[PDB]
Structures are given as structure tokens and as C-alpha cells.
PDB file of C-alpha atoms and ligand atoms in Angstrom:
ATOM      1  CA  UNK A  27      55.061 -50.061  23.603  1.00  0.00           C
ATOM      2  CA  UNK A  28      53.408 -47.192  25.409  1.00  0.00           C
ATOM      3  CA  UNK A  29      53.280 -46.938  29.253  1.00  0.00           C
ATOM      4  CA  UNK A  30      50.185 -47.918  31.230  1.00  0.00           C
ATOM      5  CA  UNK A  31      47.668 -45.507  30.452  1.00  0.00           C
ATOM      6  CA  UNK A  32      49.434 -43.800  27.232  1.00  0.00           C
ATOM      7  CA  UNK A  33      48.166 -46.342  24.941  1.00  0.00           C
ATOM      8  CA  UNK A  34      49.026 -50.113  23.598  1.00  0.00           C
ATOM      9  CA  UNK A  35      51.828 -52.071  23.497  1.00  0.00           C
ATOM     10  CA  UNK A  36      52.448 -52.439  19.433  1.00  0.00           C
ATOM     11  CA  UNK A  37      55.802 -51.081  18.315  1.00  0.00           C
ATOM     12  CA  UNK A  38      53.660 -48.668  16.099  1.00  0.00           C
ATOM     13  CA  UNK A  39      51.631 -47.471  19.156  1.00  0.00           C
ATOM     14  CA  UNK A  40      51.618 -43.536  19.940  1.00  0.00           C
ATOM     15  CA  UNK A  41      51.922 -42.578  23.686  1.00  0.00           C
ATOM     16  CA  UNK A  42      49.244 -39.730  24.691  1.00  0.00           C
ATOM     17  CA  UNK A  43      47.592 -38.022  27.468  1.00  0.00           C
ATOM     18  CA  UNK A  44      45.047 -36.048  28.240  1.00  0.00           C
ATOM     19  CA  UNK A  45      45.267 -33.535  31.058  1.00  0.00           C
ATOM     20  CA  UNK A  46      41.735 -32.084  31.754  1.00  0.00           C
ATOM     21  CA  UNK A  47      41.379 -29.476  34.621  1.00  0.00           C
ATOM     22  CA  UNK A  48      38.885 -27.743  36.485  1.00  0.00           C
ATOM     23  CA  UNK A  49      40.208 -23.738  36.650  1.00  0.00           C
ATOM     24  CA  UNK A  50      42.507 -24.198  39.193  1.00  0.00           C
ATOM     25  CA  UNK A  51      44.544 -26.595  37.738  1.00  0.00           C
ATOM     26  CA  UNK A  52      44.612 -25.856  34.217  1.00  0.00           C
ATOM     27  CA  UNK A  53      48.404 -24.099  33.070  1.00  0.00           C
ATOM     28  CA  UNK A  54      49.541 -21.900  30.856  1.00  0.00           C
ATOM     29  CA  UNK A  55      51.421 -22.758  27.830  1.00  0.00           C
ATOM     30  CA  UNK A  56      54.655 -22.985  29.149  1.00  0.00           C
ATOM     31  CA  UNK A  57      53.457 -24.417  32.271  1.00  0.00           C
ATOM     32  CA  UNK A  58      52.150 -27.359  30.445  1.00  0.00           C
ATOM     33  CA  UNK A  59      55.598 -27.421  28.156  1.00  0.00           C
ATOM     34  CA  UNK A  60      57.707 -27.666  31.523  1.00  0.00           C
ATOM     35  CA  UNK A  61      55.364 -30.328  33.149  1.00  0.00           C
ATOM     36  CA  UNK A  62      55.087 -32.700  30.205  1.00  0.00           C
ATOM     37  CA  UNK A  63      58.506 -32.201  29.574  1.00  0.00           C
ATOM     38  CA  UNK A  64      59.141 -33.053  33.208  1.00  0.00           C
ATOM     39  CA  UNK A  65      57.794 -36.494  32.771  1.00  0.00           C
ATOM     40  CA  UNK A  66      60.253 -36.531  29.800  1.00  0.00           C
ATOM     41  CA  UNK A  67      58.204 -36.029  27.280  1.00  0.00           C
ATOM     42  CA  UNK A  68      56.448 -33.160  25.896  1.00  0.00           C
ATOM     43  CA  UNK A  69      53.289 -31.702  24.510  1.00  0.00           C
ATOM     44  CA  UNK A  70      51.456 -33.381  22.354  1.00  0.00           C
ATOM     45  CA  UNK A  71      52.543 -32.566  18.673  1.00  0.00           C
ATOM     46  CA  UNK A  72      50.299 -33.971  16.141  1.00  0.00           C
ATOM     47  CA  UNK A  73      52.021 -35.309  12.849  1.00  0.00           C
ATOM     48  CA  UNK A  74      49.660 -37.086  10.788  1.00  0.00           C
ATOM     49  CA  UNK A  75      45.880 -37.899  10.960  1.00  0.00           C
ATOM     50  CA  UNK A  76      46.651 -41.048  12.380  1.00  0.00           C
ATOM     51  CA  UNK A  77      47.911 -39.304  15.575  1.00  0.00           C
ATOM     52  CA  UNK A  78      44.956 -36.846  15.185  1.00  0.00           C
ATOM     53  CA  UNK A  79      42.679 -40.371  15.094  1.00  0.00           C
ATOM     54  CA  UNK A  80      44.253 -41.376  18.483  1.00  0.00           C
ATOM     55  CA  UNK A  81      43.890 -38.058  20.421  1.00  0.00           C
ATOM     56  CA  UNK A  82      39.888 -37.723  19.154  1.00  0.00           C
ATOM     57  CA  UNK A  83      39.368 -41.419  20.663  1.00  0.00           C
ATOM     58  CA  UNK A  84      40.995 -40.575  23.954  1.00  0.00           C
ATOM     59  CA  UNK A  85      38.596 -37.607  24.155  1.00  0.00           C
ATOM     60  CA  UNK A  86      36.104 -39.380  23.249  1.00  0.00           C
ATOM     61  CA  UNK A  87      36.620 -42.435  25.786  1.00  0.00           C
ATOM     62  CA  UNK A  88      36.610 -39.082  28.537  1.00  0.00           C
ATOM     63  CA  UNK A  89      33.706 -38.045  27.710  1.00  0.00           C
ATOM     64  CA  UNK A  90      34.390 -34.644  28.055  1.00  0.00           C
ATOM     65  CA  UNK A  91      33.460 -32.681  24.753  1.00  0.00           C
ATOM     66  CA  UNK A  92      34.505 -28.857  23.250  1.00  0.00           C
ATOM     67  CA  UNK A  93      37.074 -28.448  25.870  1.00  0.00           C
ATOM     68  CA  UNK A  94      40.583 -26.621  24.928  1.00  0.00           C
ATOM     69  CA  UNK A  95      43.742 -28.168  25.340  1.00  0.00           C
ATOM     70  CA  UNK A  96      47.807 -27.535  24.547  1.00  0.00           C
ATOM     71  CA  UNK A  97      49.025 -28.580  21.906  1.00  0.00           C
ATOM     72  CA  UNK A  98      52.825 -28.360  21.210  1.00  0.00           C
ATOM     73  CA  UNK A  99      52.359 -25.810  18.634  1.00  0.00           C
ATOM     74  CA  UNK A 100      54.569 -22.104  19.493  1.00  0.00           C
ATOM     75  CA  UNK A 101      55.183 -19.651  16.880  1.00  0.00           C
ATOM     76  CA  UNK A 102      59.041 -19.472  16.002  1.00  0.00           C
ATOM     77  CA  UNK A 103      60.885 -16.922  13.806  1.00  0.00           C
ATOM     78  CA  UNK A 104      58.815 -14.934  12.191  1.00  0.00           C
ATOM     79  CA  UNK A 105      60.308 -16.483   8.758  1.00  0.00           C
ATOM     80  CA  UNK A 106      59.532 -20.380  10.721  1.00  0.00           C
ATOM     81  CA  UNK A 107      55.885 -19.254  11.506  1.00  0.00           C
ATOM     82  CA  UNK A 108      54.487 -22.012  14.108  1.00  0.00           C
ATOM     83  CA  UNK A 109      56.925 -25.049  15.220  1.00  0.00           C
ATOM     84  CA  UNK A 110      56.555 -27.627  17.400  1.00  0.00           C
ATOM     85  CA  UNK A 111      57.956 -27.860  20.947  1.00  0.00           C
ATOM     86  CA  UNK A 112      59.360 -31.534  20.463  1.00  0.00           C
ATOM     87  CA  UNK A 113      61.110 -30.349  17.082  1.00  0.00           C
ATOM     88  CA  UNK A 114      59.316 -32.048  14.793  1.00  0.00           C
ATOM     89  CA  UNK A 115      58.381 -30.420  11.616  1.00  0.00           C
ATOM     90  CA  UNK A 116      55.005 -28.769  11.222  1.00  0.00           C
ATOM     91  CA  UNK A 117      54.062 -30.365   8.175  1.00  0.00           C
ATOM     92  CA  UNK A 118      50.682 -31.908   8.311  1.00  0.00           C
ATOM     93  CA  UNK A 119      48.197 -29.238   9.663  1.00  0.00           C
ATOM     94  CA  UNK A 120      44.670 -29.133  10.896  1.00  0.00           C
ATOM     95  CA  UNK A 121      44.130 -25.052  11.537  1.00  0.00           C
ATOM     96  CA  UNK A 122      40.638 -24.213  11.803  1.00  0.00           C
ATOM     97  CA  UNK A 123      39.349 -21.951   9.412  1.00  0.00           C
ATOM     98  CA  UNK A 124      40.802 -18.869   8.879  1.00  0.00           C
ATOM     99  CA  UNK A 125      43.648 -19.467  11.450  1.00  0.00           C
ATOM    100  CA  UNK A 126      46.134 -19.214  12.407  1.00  0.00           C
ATOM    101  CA  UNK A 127      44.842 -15.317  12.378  1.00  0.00           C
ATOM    102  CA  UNK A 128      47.049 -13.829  15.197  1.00  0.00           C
ATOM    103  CA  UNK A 129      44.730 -12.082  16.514  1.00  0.00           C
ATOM    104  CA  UNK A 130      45.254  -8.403  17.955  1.00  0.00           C
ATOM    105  CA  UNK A 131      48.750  -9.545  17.378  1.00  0.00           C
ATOM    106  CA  UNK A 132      49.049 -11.099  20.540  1.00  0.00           C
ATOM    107  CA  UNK A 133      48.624 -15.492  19.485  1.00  0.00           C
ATOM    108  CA  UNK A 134      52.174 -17.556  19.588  1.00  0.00           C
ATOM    109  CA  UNK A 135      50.320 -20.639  20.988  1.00  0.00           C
ATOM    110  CA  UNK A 136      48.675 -23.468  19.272  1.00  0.00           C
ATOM    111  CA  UNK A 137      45.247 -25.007  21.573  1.00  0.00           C
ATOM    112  CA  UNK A 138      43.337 -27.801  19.890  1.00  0.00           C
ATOM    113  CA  UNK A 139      39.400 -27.510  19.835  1.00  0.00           C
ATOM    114  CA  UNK A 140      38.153 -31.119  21.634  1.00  0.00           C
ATOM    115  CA  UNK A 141      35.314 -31.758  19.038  1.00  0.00           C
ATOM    116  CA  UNK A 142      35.044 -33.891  16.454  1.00  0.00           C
ATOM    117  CA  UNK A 143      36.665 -31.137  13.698  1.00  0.00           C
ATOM    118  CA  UNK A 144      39.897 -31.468  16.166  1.00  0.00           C
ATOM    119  CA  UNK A 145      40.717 -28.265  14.759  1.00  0.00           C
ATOM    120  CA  UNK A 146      43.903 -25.772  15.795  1.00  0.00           C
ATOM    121  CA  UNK A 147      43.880 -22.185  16.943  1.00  0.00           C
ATOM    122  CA  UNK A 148      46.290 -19.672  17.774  1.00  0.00           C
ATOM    123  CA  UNK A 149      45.581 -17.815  21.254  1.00  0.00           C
ATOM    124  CA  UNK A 150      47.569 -15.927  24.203  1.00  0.00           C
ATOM    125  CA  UNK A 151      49.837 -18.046  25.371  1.00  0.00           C
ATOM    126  CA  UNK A 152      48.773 -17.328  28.925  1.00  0.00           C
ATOM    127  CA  UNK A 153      45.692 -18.761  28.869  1.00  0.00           C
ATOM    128  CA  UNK A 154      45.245 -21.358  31.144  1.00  0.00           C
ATOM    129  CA  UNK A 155      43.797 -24.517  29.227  1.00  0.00           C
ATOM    130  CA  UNK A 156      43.912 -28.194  29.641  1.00  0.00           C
ATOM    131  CA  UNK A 157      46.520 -30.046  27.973  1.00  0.00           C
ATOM    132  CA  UNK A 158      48.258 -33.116  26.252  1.00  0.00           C
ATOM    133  CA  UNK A 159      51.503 -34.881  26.580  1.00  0.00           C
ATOM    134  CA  UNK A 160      53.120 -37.650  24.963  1.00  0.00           C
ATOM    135  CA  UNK A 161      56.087 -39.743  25.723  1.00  0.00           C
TER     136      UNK A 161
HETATM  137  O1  LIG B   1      39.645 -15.420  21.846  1.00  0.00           O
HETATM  138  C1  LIG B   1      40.471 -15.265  20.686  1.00  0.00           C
HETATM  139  C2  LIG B   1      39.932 -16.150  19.579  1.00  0.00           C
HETATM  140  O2  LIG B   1      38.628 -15.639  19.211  1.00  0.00           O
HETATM  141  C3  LIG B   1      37.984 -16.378  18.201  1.00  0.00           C
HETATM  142  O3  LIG B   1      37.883 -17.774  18.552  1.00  0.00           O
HETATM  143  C4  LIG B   1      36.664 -18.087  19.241  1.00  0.00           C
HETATM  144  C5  LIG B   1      36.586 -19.621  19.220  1.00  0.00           C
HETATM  145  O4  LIG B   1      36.615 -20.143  17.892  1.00  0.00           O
HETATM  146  C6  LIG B   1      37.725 -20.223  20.082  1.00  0.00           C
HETATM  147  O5  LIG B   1      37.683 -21.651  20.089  1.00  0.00           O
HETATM  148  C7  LIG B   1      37.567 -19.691  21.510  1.00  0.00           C
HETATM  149  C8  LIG B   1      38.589 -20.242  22.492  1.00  0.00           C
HETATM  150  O6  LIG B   1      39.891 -19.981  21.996  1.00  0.00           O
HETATM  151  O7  LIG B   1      37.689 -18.249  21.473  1.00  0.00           O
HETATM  152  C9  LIG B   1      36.703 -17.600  20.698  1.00  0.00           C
HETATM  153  O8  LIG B   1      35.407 -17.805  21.208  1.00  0.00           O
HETATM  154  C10 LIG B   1      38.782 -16.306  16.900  1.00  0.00           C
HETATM  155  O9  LIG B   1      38.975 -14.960  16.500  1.00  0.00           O
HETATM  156  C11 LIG B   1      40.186 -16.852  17.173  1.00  0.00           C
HETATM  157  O10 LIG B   1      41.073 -16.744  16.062  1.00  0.00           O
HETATM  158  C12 LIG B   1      40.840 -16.156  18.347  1.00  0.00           C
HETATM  159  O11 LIG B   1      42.016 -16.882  18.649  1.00  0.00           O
HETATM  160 CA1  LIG B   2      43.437 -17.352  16.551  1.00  0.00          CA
END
């Protein structure tokens, strides 16, 4: 069971949640790793469609469309490529076209596009964009 306002209360229910911010409240990468982690949890890592499924309804319950948020994703090694933060193993992937392109060689963070492609990107890690959690 998820807490109040992370989802349902199946044994088979994921816990996510979306942080949307005007732009003086949205974080960095790292920022966002620290706070979710905080609540002792951590950024959203997305490991099958099904997960992917949840995170599109909860944008689409906000209403809120094309916005950027955090994802969990962080480039390791250069032999591990992109990992996620919570340890699990990048295995399913929904990059958007072409990416991850590390572009001008400066893109070790993973940001999820908020439309209905819920495509990944690679961008500066010091961006400040929304975010997700889980628990
Ligand atoms: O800004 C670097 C970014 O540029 C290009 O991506 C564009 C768009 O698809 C992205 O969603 C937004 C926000 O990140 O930025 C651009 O408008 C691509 O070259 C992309 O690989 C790169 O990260
Ligand atoms: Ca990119």
C-alpha cells in the first residue's frame, strides 16, 4: 500500500509524486536526489511501462502538460552509461529519439518530457526542473 497521495492501497501499487514548480522552486538534479531521498525515498526511476502508465496518469490528473521533470536517471562509468539513483537496473528504456546524445558533452542527467510520448532526455544536470519521487 502506498501512502496518502502516492497512489492505492493494492500490494502491487507503485508509490509516485509529482513535484511541479514555478522557477523559484524548481531544483537541480541533485537537489531533487537529496530531497526525495530525504523523505526516504528517491527519484522516480521508471522500470517497466506499467510504471511509465502510472506517472502519465498522474500528469494527466494535474493537468499540467509538456513540463520537464527528474527522473532518477545519472550517467555512471563511462563503461555503465546511465544508472539509476535507487540502483535499479536500467533495463527498460524510453529515450527520445536520438538520445541520449550528450550534447556539447556536458548531459549526465536523465529529465522526462510530460507529454503523452513520456519520452527521456539527457541535459545539464544543473538545470532546475520539476521533479518526481517515489517511496
Ligand atoms: O537543451 C539541450 C537539448 O536540446 C535539444 O532538446 C530540445 C528539446 O527536445 C528538449 O525537450 C528541451 C528541454 O530539455 O531542450 C531543447 O529544446 C536536444 O538537442 C537535446 O538532446 C538536448 O538535451
Ligand atoms: Ca540530450
Amino acid at each position: 500500500a502506498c501512502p496518502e497521495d502516492w497512489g492505492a492501497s493494492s500490494r502491487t501499487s507503485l508509490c509516485f509524486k509529482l513535484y511541479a514548480k514555478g522557477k523559484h522552486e524548481k531544483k537541480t538534479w541533485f537537489e531533487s536526489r537529496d530531497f526525495c531521498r530525504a523523505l526516504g525515498g528517491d527519484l522516480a526511476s521508471i522500470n517497466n511501462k506499467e510504471e511509465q502508465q502510472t506517472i502519465w496518469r498522474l500528469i494527466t490528473a494535474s493537468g499540467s502538460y509538456h513540463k520537464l521533470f527528474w527522473l532518477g536517471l545519472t550517467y555512471g562509468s563511462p563503461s555503465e552509461g546511465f544508472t539509476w539513483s535507487d540502483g535499479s537496473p536500467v533495463s527498460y528504456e524510453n529515450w527520445a529519439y536520438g538520445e541520449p546524445n550528450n550534447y556539447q558533452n556536458v548531459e549526465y542527467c536523465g529529465e522526462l518530457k510530460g507529454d503523452p510520448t513520456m519520452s527521456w532526455n539527457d541535459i545539464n544536470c544543473e538545470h532546475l526542473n520539476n521533479w518526481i519521487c517515489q517511496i
